[PDB]
Design a protein around this ligand. Structure first.
Ligand SMILES: *[C@@H]1O[C@H](CO)[C@@H](O[C@@H]2O[C@H](CO)[C@@H](O[C@@H]3O[C@H](CO[C@H]4O[C@H](CO[C@H]5O[C@H](CO)[C@@H](O)[C@H](O)[C@@H]5O)[C@@H](O)[C@H](O[C@H]5O[C@H](CO)[C@@H](O)[C@H](O)[C@@H]5O)[C@@H]4O)[C@@H](O)[C@H](O[C@H]4O[C@H](CO)[C@@H](O)[C@H](O)[C@@H]4O)[C@@H]3O)[C@H](O)[C@H]2NC(C)=O)[C@H](O)[C@H]1NC(C)=O
Ligand SMILES: *[C@@H]1O[C@H](CO)[C@@H](O[C@@H]2O[C@H](CO)[C@@H](O[C@@H]3O[C@H](CO)[C@@H](O)[C@H](O[C@H]4O[C@H](CO)[C@@H](O)[C@H](O)[C@@H]4O)[C@@H]3O)[C@H](O)[C@H]2NC(C)=O)[C@H](O)[C@H]1NC(C)=O
Ligand SMILES: *[C@@H]1O[C@H](CO)[C@@H](O)[C@H](O)[C@H]1NC(C)=O
Ligand SMILES: *[C@@H]1O[C@H](CO)[C@@H](O)[C@H](O)[C@H]1NC(C)=O
Ligand SMILES: *[C@@H]1O[C@H](CO)[C@@H](O)[C@H](O)[C@H]1NC(C)=O
Ligand SMILES: [Ca+2]
Ligand SMILES: [Ca+2]
Ligand SMILES: [Ca+2]
Ligand SMILES: [Ca+2]
Ligand SMILES: [Ca+2]
Ligand SMILES: [Ca+2]
Ligand SMILES: [Ca+2]
Ligand SMILES: [Ca+2]
Ligand SMILES: [Ca+2]
Ligand SMILES: [Ca+2]
Ligand SMILES: [Mg+2]
Ligand SMILES: [Mg+2]
Lengths: 598, 310, 10, 596, 330, 9
C-alpha cells in the first residue's frame, strides 16, 4: 500500500524491441552502487550481420534514467568451416530472460539456433551468457552431441533461469526430448573453470539434470518456469519448475532436490488448459521460516455468479509445513481475460511489518487493457487475500500488441537505501520499465477518553468562558503517538478532527457542544515528536440546556479521525511517508444522558 | 410478434444446416484423408436437415520455429527426409466457402495434399476461431444451425504454447484473411478456450470434434468448457464419419442449455433447470422445456445454446 | 527415435 | 550403558596364536544361524611343512562356546618349477584381518611372500582368500608383474580390508611403491569369475587402484586402515583410508570416490608422530544420514594441566555437513600410555534410542594395563563426549606381551536376535575374545501426587480404623508407566517404597503415618504391562495428634523409590533388562502443616 | 637436615634455585647410523676424536666418549629376506657390507681417546631397504643400559645421534607383525640388542620419560633436508637439541661444542607426580623477565637462577637433565 | 630404485 505512485522512475528503450520483457536488480558489491537491468529480446545490435540479436541494458538509479547496453558478445555467427555457419544469432531473443546475483549476471537467448557438428541443421538449443567483473563466458548446456528433437536439439535452454543461495544456476528448457522439457543446474565455479571458446559442447563434472522419460510425457514443457527454495530442511535450495502441458494439460509443478535432482513433491492443477505452471515463485510469506510456493494459472476460468464460465485466472498459495505437507489455498482473478497470475514477484517485507509480501500481475486488465498489478500482504495465518494496492498501466496500445504492463517484474531489493523493498515493473508492449519506490510507514497509536460518561443534566459545574452561566461539562481527551521504520524526520504534523453527537444529522439538533467554541466539531493541528511518549490534549464539552431538545435516549457518539501532512514529511527525494493502513485512522467513544433515578 | 423462442418461480420455454469441414492435414493424418474422399453424407442427412450445404478447409500448425523445421529444404516441404509429396505447412487455409454444390466439396477434397510439422500437438483452435468470425469468407447462413466439424487425431496447441516461438501478443478474435489465408498465424498466439468459447457462442456455432486415437478422451474432457460442442471418436477402421456426424447432430439438437449476458451492475441469475422427466436436457423434436429463473435487485440478454431473447 | 507428427510415416 | 558385563561369553584359542587379533560376525542368511569369526595369525596348522601360517576360526554363539577352524587353503607351498618354490606361506599371518559380509568371508595374510615369475626373490605381496559358501578362491592383486619395491612387491595387500554396499572389496597395501601405499577395489563377482589356481597374476576387468606418484610421498603407508561410506551423495560407498606417516608424519586420511578412485577429501593431523590415521571408521552418528568420519591418533600427547606433556592418544570426530565440508571435534584420552584410539568400532544403535553409537579402545590402560573399552553414545548434536560405559580387561598378561584387550573389536550385529547390537572384543595377548550382549532398555515414567498439600490439624475427617478417633488425612497417589523396544516381557514388576516425613532420622518422631498401617513406610509390588496404560495406586495418610509432636515448620517430604525386579524380567538366556540411563532413583513431593 | 645437592633447596609460594657449576665433566656417546645412505659420513667420523679432545678441553673438565651403531630391525619388510642378502643387504652392488642389526655396543665410555679412535676406524657399513631407520630403539637401550655403557654418576650425559634420515615410529612395526609395545628395559645379552625383532619401536613419550629419568641430554647430528624433521620435534622432547651437519662434513666437532654451549645455557624445569590433584610455576631469568616454567632461561654462565613456584589444590622437581632432583612432599 | 640403497646405485 506504500508504493509511491506519485513520482515513479520511468525508463524507455528503442521502439519495437520489447524493452521490459525481463527485469531485475543488480547490486555488484565492492562499491556502494546499484542499478537496474532490463531485457530487450528483439533489439537490433551492432553484431556483424545480425538482425534483432537481442540485448540486455543496464539502467542506472543515480539521478538520470539513462540505460546503456551490456556488450555480452560483440561477435557474429561463428563458422564451423568455410562458408558453414556454426550458429544463428539472428532472432535469438537474447535478453528474453534476465537474472542477477551480486556480481554475476546471467542472460539467455531461448531462440538461438546452431548447426550441430554432425550435420547441416538449424536447431534451437538456446544459449546463455554469464558475466562476472571483467570475465564473460558462454553457457549452452543443451548445445551438445545429443541432437535432434528426441535429444536436446530444441531444448531452448535459458527459457527460464534463477540463481541459488550457494551459487548454482538453475535453467529450464521446455523443448528437450520432444517437449518433455528439462532442468539443468551447474556450479558457477564450473561454468567459468571449464569454459573453452574453441569447444562448442562443454561438459561439466558437478552437473545435475533430468533425464529423458517415456513418450507419454511428450509435450509437457518441463522448465517453462522456475523458482528455488528449500523444501527439506537441508539448507540447500531446491528446484521448483512449472510443467504447464503436463497431466493431460492439467498442468503440474515439479519440485526436485537441489543436491541430487531427486523428485520431492508434485503439484497438479485442477482445470484443463488453465496453464497451471506458467509462473512460479517461492518465499516465506508468514514468518514461519519455511519457503511457500506460489503457482500461476493465467487461463483459468471460474464458474461465476450466474453459473457461467469466464476466463479470469487463478494463483494457488501453498504453505510449507514442518511435517513436509502443504496447506494450499487458491485465489482467483477479478477482471476477465486479464490473465491474472501471469507474473508473481516476491517483494520481501514491502511495509516492514514482519511478514513478506508478494506482487501478482494481470497484464491485460484495467482500462483499455493497459495492464494491472496487485499487491498482497502476508500474515502469520498466510496471505491476506484482499490486495492492498493496485498499479494501473499508463500507456495505451502502441501498434497491435497490448502494453502488457505486469508481464514481468522484480522486487525484494531496497535500491534507494531507505529501508523498504522497491519494485520494478515491465511493459514490453510499449518498451517501458517502471521502478516504484516504497514509501515509509508511520504507525499511530491513538487514544480517546470521555469522562464522565454518564452525564447528569442537573450537575452544572463549569461556567461558559466569559459569562456567568453554568452547564454540565465533561472532558474529552485525545492522545496521539507515532513512530516508523526508515528515513523520516523527528516531528510529524497531524490533523485531528473531533465531532460530538455524530449520530445526529444536519437537520437534527445537536446536544453536545465544545465549551470554547459552542459547536459540535473541533479541528486541531497537533505536532508530536517521532517515537516520543503519548502526547494528549484535554478538552471541555458541555450539554445544551435541558429545555432545548427532547431526545435523551439516543447515545451521544464522539468520533475522532487523524490525518497526516504528507507533503511536509518528505525525504531528500520527495518520497512521502504514508500511514499504516493496518490500523483505522479513526476511533469512536460514547456518553449518555442520565435519566431519573433516586 | 415472434421468433423461434418463447418469449422474445418465473419459467421460460423454447420452440437449414451449414457444415464446415475443418480437417487437420498434418503428417499423422495421412491415413484418414484417404478415407475422407467419399456423396453418402447427403444420402443419410437429406431427410433430417431439410436442405443443407457444406464447406471445407484445412489446418496444420504455426509455420515458425520450433513448431516446424526452419531448414530450407523442409521449411517449405516438411517431408524432405522422406522425399514425400507434401504441400507446405500452414496455419489455416480456406479453399471452399459454404456451397450447395456437393460435387465441389468432393473435388476440393480429392485434390487435397498432406503437410507435415514436428511437434505432435497441432494448431487447431487457430483455424476454428477464423472459421467462426470470418462470416463473409465462409458465408454462414443467417437462420441456419451453424456446424463446424473439426477433424484431427491429436491434441491441440493452447494459447501460451506460443511463448516458445516468441509469440506473446494475445489473439484479438477478428477475421484476418487477405486472400482466403490466415496471415496472423505467425503473429498472434493461439486462442484460449474462453476466447474460443465466447467467439463460438457469439456466432451461434456448434462444434463437432472428429477424433480417432486415444486422444479422443482429451477432447471429451473439454466439452464442459465449451457449451454447444460435441465430440465423437472416429473408428480407426475409418469410413465412420457419416454415422458420427448424424449421431452428433441428433445429440446436439437434444441439448438445450441456457446462458446469460450483462447485468444491471449487480444482479443474481439463479437459474434452476427442470427437465420433462447443467441447464440442458438430452433424450428429450418439438417438445416442452422449462427453466426457472430467480431475479433480484442490487441496463441491457439470454442466449440459447448456439441457437439463432433480450 | 522419431516421434511426433512425422512418427507414423516411418 | 546397557552392555551386559555380568555373564559375557568368553572364547579362547591356542596359546601364543594371537587368537583375537581380528574379530567379526558371520551371518550367512542361507543358514539362519550366526557365528563369530576370530583371527589367529600365529597359529600352527596342518598345511604340509608350514609354520604359523595362521587360521581363522568360526566360533559358534549357540550352545557351548566352541570354535572350529575354517578350511580355506589346505595345500602347502606351490612350486613354480622343481625345487623352485613359488610361495612362502610360513609366518604369513593369515587371519590378521577378517571382514565378513553375508555368506562371504574374506581373510588375508599380509606377510605372505612369493618368488615372482621373473626372479628368485622373496617379496611380501600379501594375499587373500574369499569363501562364498561352497566355493573358495584366492585373491592377490599385488601378486603381479609390478615386482620389486619400485612396484607392488612389498605391498602387503590385505593389511586392511573392508566390504562395500554394492558387492565390492576395498583392500589396502601400505608397502606399494616404496611404502607410498595403495588402495585396490575389485568387484566380488569378478574375483570369483576370473580365479584360476594355475595363474598367479590374475587380471581383473573393473579394478580400481591408486597410482604411483612423486618420490616425496615415500614412507606414507596408504592403506594402513580402511573404512567405507558415501561422501559425495552418489549412493555408492566411497573409500576412506589412513595414511599415518603422510605429510612429514603429521598423518593424513584420503577419501576416494568409490566409482573411479579420484581423490575427494583430505584430513591432516596436527601433531608429528601421533600416528594420526592408525584407525579409521565411517558411520552416521547424528541421525542425519551423512557418514561421519572417526580417526584415531594413539600416540598423541596433550599439554596437560601441569604444563607438561603426556601421551594419552586422541580421536577426532568429523560430522559430514550437507554443504559438503566436515564439522570436526576432537576427543582426547584419559590414562597415560594407554594408546587410546588403537581401535574404533561402530556399534549401530546400541540403545535403539534413534542415534548410532561407537566404541573406542585403549588396549594398554586400566588396572595393571589389561585394556579398556569406552562406549560413546551419539546425539543429534554429535557424539556425547562422556562415555556411558567402561569395559575393563579381566586377564593378567600371560607372558611377554600385554593382553591388548580392545586392540580389535567389531559390532553392529544383533547376534541373539533381541533387537540390540552386540559387541565382540579381542585380546590377542592372552588369546581371548568376548561377546558382549546389549541389554534391553526400559523407559519408565513415574508419577506422585499429594493432595491436599496444606494440612489442617483441626481438620479431622477420616476415621482411623481400630479406634473411635478421627485424624487429619491427606491422599498420596503414585503412578507408574513402562515401555521398551525389542524383545521384552509382556509385564514388568516394580517394587515401590514410599516413606513419609523423610527429613527426620531415627529417634525423631515421624509426624505422618499411613492410615491402614500406622507406619511411615509402605511397600507394594506393582505390576504394569510394557506399552500398556499407566497403573496408579491411591493411598491415605494422616497426622499424629497435636499433643504428640511440637515441630510444625519442617516440611513433610514424601520420598519414593521404585526398583525393578531384574531377575524375573530376564529372558530365556538370563539377560535382564536395564532401566534407561537417566532415570531418577527417587521422586519426592511435599506437604506442610498449616499454622494458625 | 643437610642440604646436599646442586639445587637450592635439596628437599604456598616458595622459591627455588640451581647452582650452575662451571666446568662440568662430560660423558659423550656417539650413536651413529651405519645404514648405506651414511656410507660417506662414517669415513668422516674417523679422525673426529683426537680433535674433539683438543676442542673439548676448553669447556670440559676431563671427559670420555663411547661408541655404538644402529641400522634397523632385522626382519621383513625392513630388510631383504633373500638368503644371499639376509646377511649382506648389498649383494646386488657387491660391496663389503656387514650384516644389518638393531643396535650394537662396541665401546663403553672410555677416557682413552685412542680407544674411540680404534673402535671407529674398525667400523663397517650396513644396509637395508626402507629409508626410515630404527634409531629410537637404540637410543632407549643406550639410556637404560647403564651398567653396559657405564654412564658416570656425576657427568652431564651427552648422546650424539648421527643420522641422515627420519626414524621409524612405534606403530610402524605392525607391518612386520610386531604388536607388543616396548617395555623400556635393558636387553643386551652380549652387548647386542636382542628384542629388536620382538618389541615394536618406542614412542616419543616412552623415549622422553626414560631420557629424563636418567638425566640424558640428546644432540641430533643430522645432514640432509631431514634436519628440519628433527628440528620440528624438539618441542616434544625437552632436553634435546638439533644441529645440521654441513654436507661438506668436518662439522661434528663444531656442532658438539656449539651444541654443548647452548645446552649448559638452557635451564628448564619440570614437574612429577601429585597428591591426586596445579604447580603453577613462573620462572624468572637473571634479567627481569617473566618466563613460563618450562621456558627456562638462555644466555645464563655461573650466575644465579630463580623462579617462584606456587603449589595449591610425594612429588619431585627435576631440572632438565641435571644430576640433582629436589623432591617435595607433605 | 630408491630408499637406503639409492645413493650407492
Ligand atoms: C538426495 O539427498 C537427500 C538428502 O538431502 C536424501 O534424503 C535423505 O534420505 C535418507 C534416506 O533415504 C534420510 O536418511 C534417514 O534419516 C532418518 C532421520 O531423518 C529425519 O531426521 C533428519 C535429521 O535432521 C535433523 O537434524 C539435522 C541436524 O540437526 C537438521 O539439519 C534437520 O533440520 C533436523 O533437525 C531430518 O533431516 C529428516 O528430514 C527429512 O525427513 C522428514 C520426515 O521425517 C521430512 O519432513 C523432511 O522434509 C526431510 O525430507 C528426517 O526428518 C534416519 O533415522 C534414518 O536412519 C535409519 O535408516 C538408516 C538407513 O538409511 C539406518 O542406518 C538407521 O540406523 C535408521 O534405521 C536415515 O538415516 C535422510 O534423512 C534424507 N535427508 C533429507 C534432507 O531429506 C535423498 O534420499 C537423496 N536421493 C537420492 C536418490 O539419493
Ligand atoms: C459533575 O460534572 C463534573 C465535570 O463536568 C465532574 O467533575 C469531574 O469528574 C470527572 C469524572 O468523570 C473527573 O475525572 C477524574 O479526574 C481524576 C483527577 O482528579 C482522575 O484521576 C480520574 O481517573 C482517571 O480518568 C480517566 C478515565 O476516566 C483516565 O484517563 C485518567 O488517566 C485517570 O486514570 C478521572 O479522570 C474530574 O476530575 C472531575 N473534575 C472536577 C473539577 O471535579 C463531577 O464529578 C460531576 N458530578 C456529578 C455528581 O455528576
Ligand atoms: C495547522 O493549524 C494551524 C493552527 O495554529 C494553522 O495556522 C496552520 O495553517 C495549519 N496548517 C495546515 C497545513 O492546515
Ligand atoms: C473509519 O475508519 C474505517 C477504517 O477502519 C472506515 O471503514 C470507516 O468508513 C471510517 N469511518 C468514518 C466515519 O470515516
Ligand atoms: C612468588 O611468585 C610470585 C609470582 O606472582 C611473585 O609475585 C612473588 O614475589 C614470589 N615470592 C616472593 C617472596 O617474591
Ligand atoms: Ca533442500
Ligand atoms: Ca512459510
Ligand atoms: Ca509485509
Ligand atoms: Ca526502497
Ligand atoms: Ca504440431
Ligand atoms: Ca560416493
Ligand atoms: Ca552424520
Ligand atoms: Ca544409540
Ligand atoms: Ca543383541
Ligand atoms: Ca630402514
Ligand atoms: Mg499431426
Ligand atoms: Mg639410511
Amino acid at each position: 500500500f506504500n508504493l509511491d505512485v506519485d513520482s515513479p522512475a520511468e525508463y524507455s528503450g528503442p521502439e519495437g524491441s520489447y524493452f521490459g520483457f525481463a527485469v531485475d536488480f543488480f547490486v555488484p558489491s565492492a562499491s556502494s552502487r546499484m542499478f537496474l537491468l532490463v531485457g530487450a529480446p528483439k533489439a537490433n545490435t551492432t553484431q556483424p550481420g545480425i538482425v534483432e540479436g537481442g540485448q540486455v541494458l543496464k539502467c542506472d538509479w543515480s539521478s538520470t534514467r539513462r540505460c546503456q547496453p551490456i556488450e555480452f558478445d560483440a561477435t557474429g555467427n561463428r563458422d564451423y568451416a568455410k562458408d558453414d555457419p556454426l550458429e544463428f544469432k539472428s532472432h535469438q531473443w537474447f535478453g528474453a530472460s534476465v537474472r542477477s546475483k551480486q556480481d554475476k549476471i546471467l542472460a539467455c537467448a531461448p531462440l538461438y539456433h546452431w548447426r550441430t557438428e554432425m550435420k547441416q541443421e538449424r536447431e534451437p538449443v538456446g544459449t546463455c551468457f554469464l558475466q562476472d567483473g571483467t570475465k564473460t563466458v558462454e553457457y549452452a548446456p543443451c548445445r551438445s552431441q545429443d541432437i535432434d528433437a528426441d535429444g536436446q536439439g530444441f531444448c531452448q535452454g535459458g527459457f527460464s533461469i534463477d540463481f541459488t543461495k550457494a551459487d548454482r544456476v538453475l535453467l529450464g528448457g521446455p523443448g528437450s526430448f520432444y517437449w518433455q522439457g528439462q532442468l539443468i543446474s551447474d556450479q558457477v565455479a564450473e561454468i567459468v573453470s571449464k569454459y573453452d571458446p574453441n569447444v562448442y559442447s562443454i561438459k561439466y563434472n558437478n552437473q545435475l539434470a533430468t533425464r529423458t522419460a517415456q513418450a507419454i510425457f511428450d509435450d509437457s514443457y518441463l522448465g517453462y518456469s522456475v523458482a528455488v527454495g528449500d523444501f527439506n530442511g537441508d539448507g540447500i535450495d531446491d528446484f521448483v519448475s512449472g510443467v504447464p502441458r503436463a497431466a493431460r494439460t492439467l498442468g503440474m509443478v515439479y519440485i526436485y532436490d537441489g543436491k541430487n535432482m531427486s523428485s520431492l513433491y508434485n503439484f497438479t492443477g485442477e482445470q484443463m488448459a488453465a496453464y497451471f505452471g506458467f509462473s512460479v515463485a517461492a518465499t516465506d510469506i508468514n514468518g514461519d521460516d519455511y519457503a511457500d510456493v506460489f503457482i500461476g494459472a493465467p487461463l483459468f476460468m471460474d464458474r461465476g455468479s450466474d453459473g457461467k464460465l469466464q476466463e479470469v485466472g487463478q494463483v494457488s498459495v501453498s504453505l510449507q509445513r514442518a511435517s513436509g505437507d502443504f496447506q494450499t489455498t487458491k485465489l482467483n482473478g477479478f477482471e476477465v481475460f486479464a490473465r491474472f497470475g501471469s507474473a508473481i514477484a516476491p517483494l520481501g517485507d514491502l511495509d516492514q511489518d514482519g511478514f513478506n509480501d508478494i506482487a501478482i500481475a494481470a497484464p491485460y486488465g484495467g482500462e483499455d487493457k493497459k495492464g494491472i498489478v496487485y499487491i498482497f500482504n502476508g500474515r502469520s495465518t498466510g496471505l491476506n487475500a484482499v490486495p492492498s494496492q493496485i498499479l494501473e498501466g499508463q500507456w495505451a496500445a502502441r501498434s497491435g500488441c497490448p502494453p502488457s504492463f505486469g508481464y514481468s517484474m522484480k522486487g525484494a531489493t531496497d535500491i534507494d537505501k531507505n529501508g523498504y523493498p522497491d519494485l520494478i515493473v515491465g511493459a514490453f508492449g510499449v518498451d517501458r520499465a517502471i521502478l516504484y519506490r516504497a514509501r515509509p510507514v508511520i504507525t499511530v497509536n491513538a487514544g480517546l477518553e470521555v469522562y464522565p460518561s454518564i452525564l447528569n443534566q442537573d450537575n452544572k459545574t463549569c461556567s461558559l468562558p466569559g459569562t456567568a452561566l453554568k452547564v454540565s461539562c465533561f472532558n474529552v481527551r485525545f492522545c496521539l503517538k507515532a513512530d516508523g521504520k526508515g528515513v523520516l524526520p523527528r516531528k510529524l504534523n497531524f490533523q485531528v478532527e473531533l465531532l460530538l453527537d455524530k449520530l445526529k444529522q444536519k437537520g437534527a439538533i445537536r446536544r453536545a457542544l465544545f465549551l470554547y467554541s459552542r459547536s459540535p466539531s473541533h479541528s486541531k493541528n497537533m505536532t508530536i515528536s517521532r517515537g516520543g511518549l503519548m502526547q494528549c490534549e484535554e478538552l471541555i464539552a458541555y450539554l445544551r440546556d435541558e429545555s432545548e431538545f427532547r431526545d435523551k435516549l439516543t447515545p451521544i457518539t464522539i468520533f475522532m479521525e487523524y490525518r497526516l501532512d504528507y507533503r511536509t514529511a518528505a525525504d531528500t527525494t520527495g518520497l512521502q511517508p504514508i500511514l499504516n493502513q493496518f490500523t483505522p485512522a479513526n476511533i469512536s467513544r460514547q456518553a449518555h444522558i442520565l435519566l431519573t433515578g433516586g | 410478434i415472434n421468433t423461434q423462442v418463447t418469449p422474445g418461480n418465473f419459467m421460460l420455454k423454447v420452440h437449414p444446416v451449414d457444415l464446415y469441414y475443418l480437417v487437420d492435414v498434418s503428417a499423422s493424418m495421412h491415413n484418414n484423408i484417404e478415407k475422407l474422399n467419399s456423396n453418402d453424407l447427403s444420402r443419410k442427412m437429406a431427410f433430417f436437415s431439410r436442405d443443407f450445404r457444406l464447406g471445407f478447409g484445412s489446418y496444420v500448425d504455426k509455420t515458425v520455429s520450433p513448431y516446424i523445421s526452419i531448414h530450407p529444404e523442409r521449411i517449405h516441404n516438411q517431408c524432405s527426409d522422406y522425399n514425400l509429396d507434401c504441400m507446405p505447412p500452414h496455419g489455416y487455409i480456406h479453399v471452399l466457402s459454404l456451397t450447395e454444390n456437393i460435387t465441389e466439396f468432393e473435388k476440393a477434397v480429392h485434390r487435397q495434399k498432406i503437410s507435415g510439422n514436428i511437434d505432435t500437438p497441432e494448431g487447431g483452435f487457430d483455424a476454428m476461431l477464423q472459421a467462426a468470425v470470418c462470416e463473409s469468407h465462409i458465408g454462414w447462413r443467417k437462420e441456419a444451425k451453424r456446424l463446424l466439424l473439426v477433424m484431427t487425431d491429436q491434441t491441440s496447441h493452447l494459447a501460451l504454447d506460443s511463448k516458445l516461438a516468441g509469440i506473446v501478443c494475445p489473439n484479438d478474435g477478428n477475421c484476418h484473411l487477405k486472400n482466403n489465408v490466415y496471415v496472423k498465424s505467425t503473429t498472434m498466439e493461439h486462442p484460449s478456450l474462453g476466447q474460443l468459447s465466447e467467439k463460438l457462442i457469439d456466432n451461434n456455432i456448434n462444434v463437432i470434434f472428429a477424433v480417432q486415437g486415444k486422444q479422443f478422451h482429451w477432447y471429451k474432457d473439454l466439452l464442459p468448457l465449451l457449451p454447444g460442442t460435441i465430440a465423437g471418436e472416429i473408428e480407426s477402421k475409418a469410413a465412420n464419419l457419416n454415422n458420427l456426424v448424424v449421431e452428433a447432430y441428433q445429440k446436439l439438437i437434444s441439448e438445450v442449455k441456457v446462458q446469460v449476458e450483462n447485468q444491471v451492475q449487480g444482479i443474481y441469475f439463479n437459474i434452476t433447470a427442470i427437465c420433462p422427466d447443467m441447464e440442458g436436457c438430452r433424450n428429450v423434436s418439438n417438445d416442452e422445456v422449462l427453466f426457472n429463473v430467480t431475479v433480484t435487485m442490487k441496463n441491457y440478454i439470454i442466449k440459447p445454446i448456439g441457437f439463432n431473447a433480450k | 527415435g522419431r516421434r511426433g507428427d512425422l512418427a507414423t510415416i516411418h
